[PDB]
Amino acid sequence: SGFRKMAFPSGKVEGCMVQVTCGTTTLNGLWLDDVVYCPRHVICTSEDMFNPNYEDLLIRKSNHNFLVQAGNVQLRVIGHSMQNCVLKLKVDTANPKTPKYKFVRIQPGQTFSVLACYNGSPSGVYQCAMRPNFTIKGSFLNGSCGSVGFNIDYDCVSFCYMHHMVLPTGVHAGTDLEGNFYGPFVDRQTAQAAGTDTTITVNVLAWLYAAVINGDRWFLNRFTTTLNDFNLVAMKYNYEPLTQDHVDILGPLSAQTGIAVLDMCASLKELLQNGMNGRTILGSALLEDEFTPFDVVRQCSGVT
Amino acid sequence: SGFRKMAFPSGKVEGCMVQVTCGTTTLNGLWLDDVVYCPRHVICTSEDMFNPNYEDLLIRKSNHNFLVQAGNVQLRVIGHSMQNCVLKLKVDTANPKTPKYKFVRIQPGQTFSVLACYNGSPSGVYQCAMRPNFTIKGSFLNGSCGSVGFNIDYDCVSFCYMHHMVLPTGVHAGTDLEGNFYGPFVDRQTAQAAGTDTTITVNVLAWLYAAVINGDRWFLNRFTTTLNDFNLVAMKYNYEPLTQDHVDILGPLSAQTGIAVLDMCASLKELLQNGMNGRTILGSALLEDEFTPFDVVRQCSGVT
Ligand SMILES: Cn1cnc(Cn2c(=O)nc(Nc3cc4cn(C)nc4cc3Cl)n(Cc3cc(F)c(F)cc3F)c2=O)n1
Ligand SMILES: Cn1cnc(Cn2c(=O)nc(Nc3cc4cn(C)nc4cc3Cl)n(Cc3cc(F)c(F)cc3F)c2=O)n1
Numbered sequence A, B: 001s002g003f004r005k006m007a008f009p010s011g012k013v014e015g016c017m018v019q020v021t022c023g024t025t026t027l028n029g030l031w032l033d034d035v036v037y038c039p040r041h042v043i044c045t046s047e048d049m050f051n052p053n054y055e056d057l058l059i060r061k062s063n064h065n066f067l068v069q070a071g072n073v074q075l076r077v078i079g080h081s082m083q084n085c086v087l088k089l090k091v092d093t094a095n096p097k098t099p100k101y102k103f104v105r106i107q108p109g110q111t112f113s114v115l116a117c118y119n120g121s122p123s124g125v126y127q128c129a130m131r132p133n134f135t136i137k138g139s140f141l142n143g144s145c146g147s148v149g150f151n152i153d154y155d156c157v158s159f160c161y162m163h164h165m166v167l168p169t170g171v172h173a174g175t176d177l178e179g180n181f182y183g184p185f186v187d188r189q190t191a192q193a194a195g196t197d198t199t200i201t202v203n204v205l206a207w208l209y210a211a212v213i214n215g216d217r218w219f220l221n222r223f224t225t226t227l228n229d230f231n232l233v234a235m236k237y238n239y240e241p242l243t244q245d246h247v248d249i250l251g252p253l254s255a256q257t258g259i260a261v262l263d264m265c266a267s268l269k270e271l272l273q274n275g276m277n278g279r280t281i282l283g284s285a286l287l288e289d290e291f292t293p294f295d296v297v298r299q300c301s302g303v304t
Helices: A054-059 A201-213 A227-236 A244-249 A251-257 A261-274 A293-302 B054-059 B201-213 B227-236 B244-249 B251-257 B261-274 B293-302
Strands: A017-022 A025-032 A035-039 A066-070 A073-075 A077-083 A086-091 A101-103 A111-118 A121-129 A148-153 A156-166 A172-175 B017-022 B025-032 B035-039 B066-070 B073-075 B077-083 B086-091 B101-103 B111-118 B121-129 B148-153 B156-166 B172-175
Touching: A017 A035, A017 A121, A025 A066, A035 A156, A054 A077, A066 A077, A066 A086, A111 A156, A201 A244, A201 A251, A201 A261, A201 A293, A227 A261, A244 A251, A251 A261, A251 A293, B017 B035, B017 B121, B025 B066, B035 B156, B054 B077, B066 B077, B066 B086, B111 B156, B201 B244, B201 B251, B201 B261, B201 B293, B227 B261, B244 B251, B251 B261, B251 B293
Parallel strands: A101 A156, B101 B156
Antiparallel strands: A017 A025, A017 A066, A025 A035, A035 A086, A066 A073, A077 A086, A111 A121, A111 A148, A148 A156, A156 A172, B017 B025, B017 B066, B025 B035, B035 B086, B066 B073, B077 B086, B111 B121, B111 B148, B148 B156, B156 B172
């Protein structure tokens, strides 16, 4: 009962966060086994940030230029290498708190938990989604560079995001853990613009199901639509088109609830055209698109 | 930049969660030093839950009736005692992962993070507020009894909530860690009703400040009101009355923003009377009342 923006427990990640300083530039890094992963922007002095030549800056550095602090313990840098936009600092000590992990790239519309960190120190946890324009609507202040996003699958942490920068619109941009940006951005301190964002339709439908599971039923009706008639309406309102694979993903919720996907699509059509008229769904007055079908199952049926 | 429902990192609590079984009844408990704290409802068999006589049930038990599992490790119960609605199971091993901690009772309107647990296993983290009617709007399934709420002050975990039960309306009720209920509830499986809830006015004002800090300014105006004129309007709309101490708490946000509290109160007056007319604030179409003034400072200025 109830429905909240729920993050994954963050303890397994917290013991991996460290602080990385290179001269007067400092940010967060991720310590797994005997490697520390962090944004390569850390080798920039303030003069280099606008237009860095990262290959040039890196060859001018040595291992002792890199200060890595894990709490009070200092870690000895014994090697360094660049992989796309991340720096890999080999250290002399393997992190005894290394969880089982993997590096995965997520798709637009998927959700993950962020551990926001400052000076190597975990500060807070929240859930967000990768937007279709490859930015996230995070909550980050100065000093959060290197903070990570992750999911938990049983025992295993899947890292999927490393925070790099803020865009002029206030949204955030970053890379996967192999250093490849999400979206068309580059790691330099310039004004870069995001493409126009759209609403994640399958998620809105997942959330309507969650509402029906929690006793909000006022928006349902008899009608059924077809994919094509729906998608014609979706596009007018800046919603991602719906596919057959989307419909199939919503299968478990369809079953548990007794409402066909195309049945629920007709309700969504109505909500889009007529609005909500001061009514709320799951305590919201807007259609919420940052819960996936898996988030709903996890919170309305049970997974630990 | 950005604004999210942010929870505290949960790692320090996660290593304290255990599973407590007494016959066929099972729930979560909190292992600190050599004590395990859990809801006393665990000594009820299914027949006892409607109208337990807890003093009777407890004397009929012995230490070996209590199965406590910390992951795979079983803990040896060497003593038991009841304190109001919580059971204290003394065990033979002190939890090596015990953080610095304290037990504090929170006031209505304050916020805290919940670690929702099942079978002793941490499942998710979210932030919520204690409502003025002493319930919380949580997200909990069967098996979450004993889950805890907490805050973090530097190094120190302040535990403030132990989850007991769900009410017919879908909201949740629990105790502090000394076993005293929040609100007029009792730990038995009967239908109990909550008092009528109200909106936490000081929090709504804290959130309007957060919006101004993040560039949402459309709702501001010239007018100033007085406490008395505002409180006259607040009460018509089921808002908690505002006090001088509330005004003082909003001091830091007033300063950082250049907008007097009574200035912001006039905007809130307008929003209450005219509504928002399809505009949003911080991505919400409702006035949000579950961020305290301290939550806003923490997320818009910086505290780790
Ligand atoms: C407001 N906000 C929201 N998210 C962010 C993230 N972020 C950040 O934390 N820091 C950045 N630049 C740095 C300045 C430094 C000054 N010192 C002493 N050390 C510093 C280290 C960093 Cl990383 N930036 C900007 C930024 C970071 C990049 F990694 C990048 F490739 C381009 C950029 F423009 C930043 O966005 N701040
Ligand atoms: C849907 N929901 C939302 N929150 C809750 C919390 N909660 C819970 O998890 N369990 C409860 N009763 C139990 C049944 C058991 C069956 N077995 C085998 N073991 C059990 C243990 C418990 Cl605790 N309840 C009900 C409940 C729990 C109390 F602690 C109480 F004092 C009165 C109550 F009515 C419950 O609300 N479920």
